[PDB]
Write an enzyme that holds these catalytic residues in place. Structure first.
Site, short mmCIF file in Angstrom:
data_model
loop_
_atom_site.label_atom_id
_atom_site.label_comp_id
_atom_site.label_asym_id
_atom_site.label_seq_id
_atom_site.Cartn_x
_atom_site.Cartn_y
_atom_site.Cartn_z
N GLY A 80 21.28 58.26 17.93
CA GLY A 80 20.82 57.04 18.06
C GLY A 80 19.38 56.83 18.31
N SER A 81 18.84 58.04 18.73
CA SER A 81 17.19 58.08 19.09
C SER A 81 16.32 57.96 17.80
CB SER A 81 17.18 59.39 19.65
OG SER A 81 15.76 59.79 19.76
N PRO A 82 15.43 56.84 17.93
CA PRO A 82 14.52 56.70 16.67
C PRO A 82 13.80 57.97 16.48
CG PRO A 82 14.61 54.87 17.96
CD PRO A 82 15.58 55.97 18.84
#
Lengths: 206, 206
Positions: free
Chosen positions: B8-10
């Site tokens: 989920g981390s950009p």
């Protein structure tokens, strides 16, 4: 090359030190009164429309100090060591430049800008963020001569522009023993450090 | 190459998209339970000691997503366009990467991290900072196909990892007409965009 700058600004001094380390002459322009009333539109159109520092290199306009620094190093550097071509070494310089922006300079500005500019009351939480950033820098320097490699690099020049400002503002660096050792050894190695960084600290010492 | 990441981390997705655009295989490692109790010291010593994403390229450890991205582009890119060798074009990509970090991703995190993680009350002042960053991005895109040059570059990949997260969180991009046009045109051009970015947005859509 035109260099739009403010002498007290750490990012401006980082660029100035880079030009000096590369033996690059720049035409310094002072952006003091660029927000003053009654400046002609013809004068306003030449003003940098984004942030200071900005260079104009034969029509090529570039803001963002750390992007200016790596541009100057590659476009005008005679040798490798300030911004090595080697991709792993270059990656570590780049990494340290992002750290410099996002931790060290950020912490400096968060604390000192409200105080210096707005005469605001000190923020103890923001003050401790400087020590947090300096603790990370101190760890990078453990067992190292420089902040991002075996030689002086652009990361040393960018970081010193803020660390020297901290000392000029009476921030005690002693407990960061690696920062203190590095700061003492780096100043004599930085070409024209006195002219292009130390002289611009005067507003802070006052 | 090992890739320590959170889907989920950009910034993790920015690196994943870079590897896909370069046709680089990486061995993905999930850092979920790395802070859980009772993980062996032998397991802890392999964990990245700094921030996520981190790559391990045959022993070369590199954190800081945007430093990873430019390292991968130069070390493994077959052609120029993602991170041009031309120094002026490269400088603009670098400039936009600093903007992405310091304005766009910063504004995203300042607003959504307290809400998403700590279930905090919305900060209206931090919310408006997203629009401020997006207004700057929209201006960069005026009359342009891409965020930092005439072709898709690393800056498009880094910026899309956050802009796509904004849309997944129901942030309306319409008034940023250039951002909207760019976002619509860039997704079909990004190799494996669905696999390496859109799929990791699921936690936010929920």
């Amino acid at each position: 090359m035109d260099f739009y700058q403010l002498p007290g600004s750490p990012p401006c001094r980082a660029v100035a030190l880079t030009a000096a380390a590369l033996d690059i002459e720049m035409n310094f322009k002072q952006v003091n009164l660029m927000n003053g009333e009654h400046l002609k539109p013809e004068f306003l159109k030449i003003n940098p429309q984004h942030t200071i520092p900005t260079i104009d290199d034969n029509g090529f306009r570039l803001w963002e100090s750390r992007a200016i620094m790596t541009y100057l190093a590659d476009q005008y550097g005679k040798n490798d060591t300030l911004y090595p071509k080697d991709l792993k070494k270059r990656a570590i310089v780049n990494q340290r430049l992002y750290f410099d922006m996002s931790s060290l300079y950020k912490s400096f500005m968060d604390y000192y800008y409200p105080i210096i500019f707005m005469k605001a009351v000190k923020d103890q939480a923001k003050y401790e963020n400087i020590g947090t950033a300096l603790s990370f820098l101190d760890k990078f320097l453990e067992g190292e001569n420089y902040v991002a490699g075996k030689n002086m690099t652009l990361a040393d020049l960018s970081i010193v522009s803020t660390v020297s400002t901290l000392e000029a503002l009476d921030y005690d660096l002693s407990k960061y023993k690696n920062v203190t050792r590095w700061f003492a050894k780096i100043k004599p190695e930085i070409p024209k450090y006195e002219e292009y960084n130390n002289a611009g600290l005067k507003m802070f010492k006052e």
